[model samples]
Target: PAWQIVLWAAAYTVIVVTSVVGNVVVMWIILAHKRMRTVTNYFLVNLAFAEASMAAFNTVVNFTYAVHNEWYYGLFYCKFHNFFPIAAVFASIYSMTAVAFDRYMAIIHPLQPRLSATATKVVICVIWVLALLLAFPQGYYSTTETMPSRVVCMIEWPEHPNKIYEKVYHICVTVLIYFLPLLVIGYAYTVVGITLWASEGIDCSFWNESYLTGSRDERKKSLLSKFGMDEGVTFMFIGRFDRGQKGVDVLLKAIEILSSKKEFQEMRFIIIGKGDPELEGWARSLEEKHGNVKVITEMLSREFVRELYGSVDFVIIPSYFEPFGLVALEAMCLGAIPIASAVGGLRDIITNETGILVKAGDPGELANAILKALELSRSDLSKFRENCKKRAMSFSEQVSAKRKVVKMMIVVVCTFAICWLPFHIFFLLPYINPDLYLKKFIQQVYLAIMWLAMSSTMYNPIIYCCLNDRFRLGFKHAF
Candidate 1:
């Protein structure tokens, strides 16, 4: 499942990046050269713009939605995603149709004037206008719904349980975007094809005006060309994709409400160390809407954070499960008090004076804790700061090398303990009983553990292939 997600993300990234980049160069090339700006070329330009816009706005967004099976971009982008892509598809289709017609006019009725440059621009505008109108219904119906399992984005058309509107809309899209375009392309290119063939001996001019790269009298030449900072009470969040495990969404929603208060007006929120692509997009969108917020998704080294934790007044941990409670300890180590969920290790790691704990998954409680901290008097706060620094000193690093190393060892030591415990349990049972050959079930139990023990080796090739790209390919070829 992990490799599958990675592979899908890589493939989607390649498609979006290539489509956007290639179309952009195509646009630059045509626009920079005067002679390249023909009527047909202008239509192609319109087509390219539509494609680039489609790739930029929809490709990865669509992939993320399908990948997660949830709508994480909120109401605004859900509407934009559903609305804009349809218009772009329409624009791409009709722009090509306009080109076919331009060629149809140029060859079939050679005496007629083709679209002048300004007129061509107007047609491009007209194409987009119609596109927007056609896509308006989709935008109007676009919505996001939250379910117990996941979230969703959809076109919520009206027409009762029978849903006449849903059926009607799809039919309209199919006919307009598919059938009608097929007909137009079918006739236009078909006629143009015949006309070009008939005129092979007469004049090469028709082919020039028609799909030809350029007109040539006998020779041709080709050319190609190619933040500030300031702050108030700063906060930081490092989250993964697990809404249940980390409670990142709760933090995001809580921040939105907190941002409107006078307490927030001066305060700065430096949020996000990322995981899910869609959730990070939401974090960036939050930064866009509110000037007081900043987001970072990349890995921040411990050396940077060692100085960083002390620089801020408080560090917030909204995780539902605080297994290690390492961040809270580190925050206290630097005399930056932690306001975190009152769960697991958090309860012991913090106290009322040294740090604050609120109910996990309750953003309202979380925000209140934040407000409580901001409102504390200097007289009371001074002693609390001293306590945090002195309390953290007791968490010495000489043997454990800080809480981090202890946590790092848990994966190795605990797993080994669990795996070997059953055999030792059966071994010790004989000493307690001192009975020869014990129960008949002991023989069966022995074989089960033997099978389970051998199964440990099964994980070897799997972890190797899954964790390393080269191992995956080597195993692929070996298979």
Candidate 2:
């Protein structure tokens, strides 16, 4: 008996010390190193805090209870001993899953801005608050009682502890702690792994790797030649050719009007991106009617899209109900003036100084706008192009804000669907079979699953330190 107690204490002490020291060092590195303070590292700091607190608070108490087979710390500690560990675990798993999604965005959409430092702090605070709330029932239900000589600390259900209620609670814990986080992490990694595998063998230098080697004038000439500098005025439509909301009919009618004019003989129309069957049929008919129309119905690479934008003089966006026209913004950024419909956020991005806005579904108004755009003198077109770039830069801040909001939405949705759903179903099963209620085997399974869930806290440091080069360097220097 003495040997058993001594061995247990020694093992517990080792684990407790290692967890605290390791997590504290991780926290210090992230806080001290400027390069380590990325959005993902912020989550790593919170994860370390959770692991350290859990080890510091519970390791000795649990080991002592195991050896003595008695509750020596009395009633108040019984509540805290039960409460803090569960809360810490909840916080840790959510934090790790948050980092997973962060890495997903970082790798998949490198151009988008990441979470800000202030926002990350706010998110960590919210995680802690939610964890505290999640673990409140443990503290409330914990009790200590003396029976025959030894006092035992355990959860005590009420005189009529409803079987349904306990079942629901266990189910919630299982789903939120294990199933949901597992789904989020798995989904994120699957996408990242597949994408990396697909691109692994492809060379990154397929395009002009020697563009910068030439002189300034030569470089300018090279760019001009690539973009077809001698081109007559060309109008571009780059996006989905959905006949329902994109108002492709308005675009076709406007093109038809321009084609009827003798002065617009040299004008060409280029449409890019995929479309539905109806749009394909309409596009085919229009191409047959007008010899100047060109349709390429397929998604283009980022480089090809940029080149196409550069070659065009104008980009047309005639959506009847656009939430936000990213194509217009892209065209403007590429120095191609956009003539967008006066609907939704399109008006917000386009101004008179940058480009013209026509009424949605009004072919005559759009035709007049196109005529005005084509009539601009070379100097006036240059001035409008400069103004377009400025206007696009102004909207860049707004676009970044919108992107952050959408990312937050994705996190919330993933947590609810992937993390919370399983627990809800598990807890509901007790209603169908009362035998599982308060059964020892079911309870042991619950504890085993919970321990697995708590392991999630340690994953963030591994993900950040191994995957991100900047974080690995920071960890090396801080240690």
Candidate 3:
């Protein structure tokens, strides 16, 4: 599995070059063009900002997390590790949603007046306020909790697991992050589908459908429209509807097969990736018997990837021979609980609350294990989802992203400032003049902060090489 990191390292070059080019182009066009200044474009402006922030944050921080999740610097950076992503994600989600709304307006209600610059600015301000509202809790509660293994960054969830509070949080995030944006994207894409596919001259379904001319035309239009003199004409746009269509086709296939039986739709089936021949055949057998059962063998494309994880209720990673299971880490990110075969790093990934770990390689035991996941009601599922997301934070792409960028840099300002400040306050200050007993506590805190800073650097890129495509590439080339 560590070797798999070698595989992904190949993509780091692509990720870096493309990200730099993509983000830079977006920024250049937005800032330079006159007519490009529109309310919708503002969303693009923000989107570009998010990507840039992510890139900037990751550019150096990636290394820090990779070496090991450590804070070499002082306390100010500890706060930043806890802070930057919350702000960046808030910006990212806001822009994505705003783009969706902008498209919805343009497509669903073209005749209506578009959002004005002033209105857009106000909306941008509102987005910042809303982002802060959601992130406020992190500021209020986020802190570094020291442990034997590492310095873990965590936030306090509502201590009382009342149905009302849990549901409220889930519903809010569902609305803000998943459902609302899903609706907006759905609507905008629907209109886009209608307009593009309905046109008589162009047929996407045709096998030999003039890929050359079509691609050329598209590139030309993108260039012209994107670089239009008016600048405000419209923002640069990329359409992956063809890709979305493919995902829908795959989903529809699953639906047609699964929804045919009531139990199939209702019965929760644990999904296992069908990369291996045996897993594939086993999945086929399951599919043959129960329409609801599915073996996940499809290619991992961006359009279908998130949906692949989101749609699944729980993931089953039954690698009998592996030293550790990483698929579960992925499952957690998309809010899918994992029912993993207990072994190696598998134990490291799954907590009792987040998922179930069964005996490795025992199909009978695995079957029984899956029942545990299915027994949960929506409320139980919500709790698992929250824990999964919370657990996911430790290994999140955003977190890793920050660490990856900072890794290679000889010095890190943020980590030093954020992680060390608290320890310095408690231990180094010496002004508080703790009793002899407290002196040891102070030393421990200082040591913990230093260790956390150093460790944060090592882990992320290591994980990146193992999981992420782009970082893997850079890591490989460097090696």
lDDT of 3 by residue, 371-444 (tens): 44445533446667678867766644443443333232112222223443453344334333634563435433
Residues 63-150 of candidate 2 have per-residue lDDT tens digits of 3563446655565777787788667767876877787777678767767767778988898999999988988886777777678978
- Clash-forming residue pairs, model 2: 175-423, 180-418, 180-419
In candidate 2 the C-alpha lDDT for residue 280 amounts to 70
Clash number for each model: 0, 3, 72
lDDT per residue (tens digit) for residues 244-297 in model 1: 688777778788779778787755676757777777888889889886777878
Error of 3 at 304 (Å): 46
lDDT comparing candidate 1 with the true structure: 0.61
User: What TM-score does each of the candidates earn?
Assistant: 0.41, 0.55, 0.37
By summed lDDT, which 10 consecutive residues of candidate 3 come out lowest?
230-239
Question: What's the C-alpha lDDT at position 236 in model 2?
Answer: 79
Ranking by lDDT: 2, 1, 3
Off by over 4 Å in 2: 1-48, 55-77, 90-151, 161-231, 237-242, 245-247, 259-266, 270-311, 315-360, 375-377, 380-451, 467-470
Worst 10 residues of 1 by lDDT: 217-226
Best by TM-score: 2
Could you report the Cα RMSD, in angstroms, for every candidate shown? 37.5, 8.6, 25.7
